Design a protein around this ligand. Structure first.
Ligand SMILES: *C(=O)[C@H]([C@@H](C)O)[C@@]1(C)CC(S[C@@H]2CN[C@H](C(=O)N(C)C)C2)=C(C(=O)O)N1
Length: 246
């Protein structure tokens, strides 16, 4: 009789990250209970730059302080953008789905350094430090946040418990919908800080199950330039399936 290796979801997710030859953590929160998965659990309490995940908070601050509205069309003013898909006029919500940096730089500059630092410190996001550069403080420092802090933030968003108006949080939630099928909804925001070393990849969001239960997640991993952007989505979805969340 041979031995049998018993692969629980903890071992599977740890080895999912090992297979990509990188370090990563998946933070899960539901019913005010947080679980850690992956091959680098100490990442969960390490500060990283939020990169494009900060768009969620940018949008909340801009809508709450009436610097924009969900129907405003941000015009493409003619510079070569990083992707041709970004070279069009679009709303805040379309820019959220596309992670269209220049729209959120326009919004950040409307908010202004003063209001932004004060709203970020009021929310208590991460180390709550934005420095003097209002258009990149979430990409190159000084703002940093742990994956646990991101799961706590996004779970509050999903529950409309952040210190913002209900309608503002509801509108930002609708910008983050990624997938709907069979009574499940998945919301989230990817991020990838390429200019810092080591690079950091994010995928933060939540699942709404058919009975309404919310299961929030923050995936955080080291990226390398040869990786496809979809590696974050692949690792998230396989792990969510292994955990029976979807
Ligand atoms: C968000 O974090 C990031 C901001 C910081 O620019 C943004 C908008 C770009 C990317 S992907 C990035 C651009 N092209 C690189 C690439 O694919 N290769 C081949 C290295 C990485 C993202 C993202 O989340 O994917 N968002």
């Amino acid at each position: 009789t041979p031995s049998q290796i018993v692969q629980g979801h903890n071992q599977v997710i740890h080895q999912y990250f090992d297979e990509k030859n990188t370090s990563g953590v998946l933070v899960i929160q539901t019913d005010k209970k947080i679980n850690l998965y992956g091959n680098a659990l100490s990442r969960a309490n390490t500060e990283y730059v939020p990169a494009s995940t900060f768009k969620m908070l940018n949008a909340l601050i801009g809508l709450e302080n009436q610097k924009t509205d969900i129907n405003e069309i941000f015009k493409w003013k003619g510079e070569k953008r990083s992707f041709t898909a970004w070279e069009k006029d679009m709303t805040l919500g379309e820019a959220m789905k596309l992670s269209a940096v220049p729209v959120y730089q326009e919004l950040a500059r409307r908010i202004g350094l003063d209001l932004m630092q004060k709203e970020v410190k009021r929310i208590g996001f991460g180390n709550a430090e934005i420095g003097q550069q209002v258009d990149n403080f979430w990409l190159v420092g000084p703002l940093k946040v742990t994956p646990i802090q991101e799961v706590e933030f996004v779970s509050q968003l999903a529950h409309t418990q952040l210190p913002f108006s209900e309608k503002v949080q509801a509108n930002v939630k609708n910008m983050l919908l990624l997938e709907e099928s069979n009574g499940y909804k998945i919301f989230g925001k990817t991020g990838w800080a390429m200019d810092i070393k080591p690079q950091v990849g994010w995928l933060t969001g939540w699942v709404e199950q058919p009975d309404g239960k919310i299961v929030a997640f923050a995936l955080n991993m080291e990226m390398r330039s040869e990786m496809p952007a979809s590696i974050r989505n692949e690792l998230l979805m396989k792990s969510l399936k292994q955990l029976n969340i979807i």
